Nucleic acid binder design. Structure first.
Ligand SMILES: [Cl-]
Ligand SMILES: [Cl-]
Ligand SMILES: [Cl-]
Ligand SMILES: [Cl-]
Ligand SMILES: [Mn+2]
Ligand SMILES: [Mn+2]
Ligand SMILES: [Mn+2]
Ligand SMILES: [Mn+2]
Ligand SMILES: [Mn+2]
Ligand SMILES: [Mn+2]
Ligand SMILES: [Mn+2]
Ligand SMILES: [Mn+2]
Ligand SMILES: [Mn+2]
Ligand SMILES: [Mn+2]
Ligand SMILES: [Mn+2]
Ligand SMILES: [Mn+2]
Ligand SMILES: [Mn+2]
Ligand SMILES: [Mn+2]
Ligand SMILES: [Mn+2]
Lengths: 109, 97, 78, 96, 97, 107, 99, 86
DNA sequence: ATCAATATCCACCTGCAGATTCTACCAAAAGTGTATTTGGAAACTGCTCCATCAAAAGGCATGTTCAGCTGGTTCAGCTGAACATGCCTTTTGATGGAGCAGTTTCCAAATACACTTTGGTAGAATCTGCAGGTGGATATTGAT
DNA sequence: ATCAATATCCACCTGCAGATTCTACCAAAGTGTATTTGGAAACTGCTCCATCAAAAGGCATGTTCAGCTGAACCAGCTGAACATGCCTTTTGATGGAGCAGTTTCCAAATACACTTTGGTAGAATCTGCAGGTGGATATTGAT
């Protein structure tokens, strides 16, 4: 008789799905074989980046006094963060708009 | 009667639209355009509504970014008015033309 | 139909782009450029559509086409 | 008949959102952005890992290929913290 | 005391054959040939990658001459796409019979 | 029967078997159809032919019987579509096209 | 007399001459030393195939030439014929190399 | 042994070399502040390519940077280079 | 720089409709247990080709003169911003039905392995453009 | 409008370093056989897409003028051209560091059978938002 099933994600201390990520790795034709630690490492990295973006975007959403993050807040957070901006430099967030910016020379006086 | 000095309402408009996220082209002209272009590639096509929305999101974000660059090129030539030659300089440096 | 992208629309796009003053020749230039962009994306989205043997262009066709053009879009299924 | 069964990362993104900001929720369109995001970084890393293995004439993608791929793909501090989180997760998993 | 050596493949022989077809009089420097090998590998990987993504989007586990054809349409500009689809379709129909 | 190469059956100069092997071992998909390597081999042969055509011309314009990387460059860059296909590519030892902005010429 | 060309004549002559040739324009040894210094700041005791160094030098010089063409276009845009740091920066900013 | 300490080598990229590069680029007149900008820009470019090449080298558990490491680095930086393998 | 005098923007409320969260089934999928296989790490070590050094070979650094380029200044033509109104296009919101998409089913076509030639590669052995050296012809530039 | 003073151009040679041809192994392609299976092809649900007609509401249009751009003029000064002096880079051998070729044995992978959770879809919440206001902030013109 089998023991009580423990998800790999829980074994890894993660919220993101290690099992799914492993499946996706196996079925995406990236290689013949996928090592046991690879989906754990990748799931952890995905979770980290998701957390970073949600950290900054939550700050953005409640500094403008909302309790729900909307795409605008994601844009504000990505673009105001140099490294995220770099990572997503060739990406458009739908309904995100732009950062407030007027070239100084365009101002009066 | 009241009159704002030329440029005041412009700056106000920059602030207004940089503060918002709504699409700036009217839906229907845009869609009719999408359908014309497509029909030059493949005929009796239909479009999901989301497909048209994604094309418009893409178009507007591209055009907004291209206008930012164009404006940098105008500022570079010591003007504050963008011209076709600015758009072309931006596009040629971007490797688009 | 390209004339349907009106002077005020293009003006708003330019305003979000931070542009303060606009030469009158911009609008035709802008229309040409938008048309080239759309042709480029739409040609690929439609290629994807015919490959899947459909007659309806789906959001994913547009998203994949955009990803090929180095214009990745988040929020429409990819 | 039944429509398809769709997977997405929504539930996990939600869990992370609650860890980081217990007070804050998220719009469905925002959730769509975040989904697109996870899929995109996923595919970038896995693709880099795939090429790494092919260059080196190897048929297995291990946590090493993933790590090198992370160093290649992420800028600076983001790369450092991702490599740290990754090694940490693998270690915890291994011991457990 | 026991001895060691190895074998590397390239497209040189085939490039040379094609060169003789289009320019019977002309030869080619080894560096030029290196450029041409890079070219064949580059286009190869681009087409195969486009075909891979294509097959994946459409839930298909086999890459056929159809995926290759679509990938070629996606990657090549205009007339090159036309003439490549011609050469490919021709080669395949000839092969099949 | 007497062995007939796949390239010969398809009428190609490029190696069909090789292209097949490279497709199977590159992890592009679980399976590769029998027609995919023929089509791809043919397309590669075609683009190679196009480029060697133009470069042979550049070479005979420079009165050379042997193609060098400079001729490959000249051929790619003077041709709108190859230039577009290789728009993000550097030809080593290729140089650039003769081009001086008009405004720089003497008055 | 003694002979002297007017400023710009030899410059245009040099443009014709270097656009006509394909040789690397940076001296080999300095470029090598730079490559090894940077690399050594990433990882110590590295060696290089000479092909590796040549490949870096082909890539660098091709990049710098292309950036100089764009820069020149930005100068010409501002009604000048002299390239300046502000031109290089505008070129890199539009290229999305900096932002 | 070991070689002598490499310092300040970006300065070995001389004013005449930068001038020739600019000439191939079609540049007629050159401000005196260009030479430092160019050096700066060059170093960023190199730092970026060499970093990736070395990552590939380290991954392959080698001590020698190979031409392929550089070519893969270039290819991922969107600067594909023909003529050196692959 | 101040005051008025407007004009537009932006917090601040409010109620409640719609978008989010909440609940509770249920197939699909992740996990577990056991059995085998196997890709590749590690260990040796032949054999390329890298680091090193010092004599050659050859540009770079340096300072001075001044041509002409840049940037500041002024100013009027005229272009593009601002604005006010009713017509014409876009928006909104029901419908019927086109065609994605869900299910299922079999054969052409895929993979896998063995067996046997055969095209491709690696030097070895020739072969031959063209690099590099020169000199004379023609072209171009700049001073009178 | 001419001459010098230079620079580029453009054949012509000749030898050898680099390209082509030649052979001989064996690395892989082709053939043959047997076994699984992916994905058209066909047959319908049911999503949403195209259409259409009566709403609103933004744009087209034409006119006044603020001020931006582009021209014209000019002086300060910066960067090109060049002659000089010699230090740095290129070039050629060559031992040996370390890739790369081989072999082999496990830690780590797959293979197969069997049995909680993510997705889904109404119900039950709750929060922005649409709409309205008035105070806040900003701009314009006359002293
Ligand atoms: Cl692993
Ligand atoms: Cl213009
Ligand atoms: Cl096929
Ligand atoms: Cl400057
Ligand atoms: Mn250092
Ligand atoms: Mn066995
Ligand atoms: Mn084995
Ligand atoms: Mn003067
Ligand atoms: Mn006036
Ligand atoms: Mn039907
Ligand atoms: Mn034979
Ligand atoms: Mn010569
Ligand atoms: Mn089946
Ligand atoms: Mn030796
Ligand atoms: Mn050793
Ligand atoms: Mn078994
Ligand atoms: Mn659950
Ligand atoms: Mn409101
Ligand atoms: Mn009231």
């Amino acid at each position: 008789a089998r023991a009580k099933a423990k998800t790999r994600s829980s074994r890894a201390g993660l919220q993101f799905p290690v099992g799914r990520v492993h499946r996706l790795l196996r079925k995406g034709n990236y290689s013949e074989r996928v090592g046991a630690g690879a989906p754990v490492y990748l799931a952890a990295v995905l979770e980290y980046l998701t957390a970073e973006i949600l950290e900054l975007a939550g700050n953005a959403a409640r500094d403008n006094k909302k309790t729900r993050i909307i795409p605008r807040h994601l844009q504000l957070a990505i673009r105001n963060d140099e490294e995220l901006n770099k990572l997503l430099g060739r990406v458009t967030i739908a309904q995100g708009g732009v950062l407030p910016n007027i070239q100084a020379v365009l101002l009066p006086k | 009667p009241h009159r704002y000095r030329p440029g005041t309402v412009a700056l106000r408009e920059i602030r207004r639209y940089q503060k918002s996220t709504e699409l700036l082209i009217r839906k229907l002209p845009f869609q009719r355009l999408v359908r014309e272009i497509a029909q030059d590639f493949k005929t009796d096509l239909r479009f999901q509504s989301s497909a048209v929305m994604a094309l418009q999101e893409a178009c507007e974000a591209y055009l907004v970014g291209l206008f930012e660059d164009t404006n940098l090129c105008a500022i570079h030539a010591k003007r504050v008015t963008i011209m076709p030659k600015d758009i072309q300089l931006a596009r040629r440096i971007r490797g688009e033309r | 139909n390209i004339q349907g992208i009106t002077k005020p629309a293009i003006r708003r796009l330019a305003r979000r782009g931070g542009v303060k003053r606009i030469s009158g020749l911009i609008y035709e230039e802008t229309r040409g450029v938008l048309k080239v962009f759309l042709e480029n994306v739409i040609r690929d989205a439609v290629t994807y559509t015919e490959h899947a043997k459909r007659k309806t262009v789906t959001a994913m066709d547009v998203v994949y086409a955009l990803k090929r053009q180095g214009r990745t879009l988040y929020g429409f299924g990819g | 008949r039944k429509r398809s069964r769709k997977e997405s990362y929504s539930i996990y993104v939600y869990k992370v959102l609650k860890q980081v900001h217990p007070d804050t929720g998220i719009s469905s369109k925002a959730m769509g952005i975040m989904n697109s995001f996870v899929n995109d970084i996923f595919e970038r890393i896995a693709g880099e890992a795939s090429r790494l293995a092919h260059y080196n004439k190897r048929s297995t993608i291990t946590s090493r290929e993933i790590q090198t791929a992370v160093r290649l793909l992420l800028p600076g501090e983001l790369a450092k913290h991702a490599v740290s989180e990754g090694t940490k997760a693998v270690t915890k998993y291994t011991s457990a």
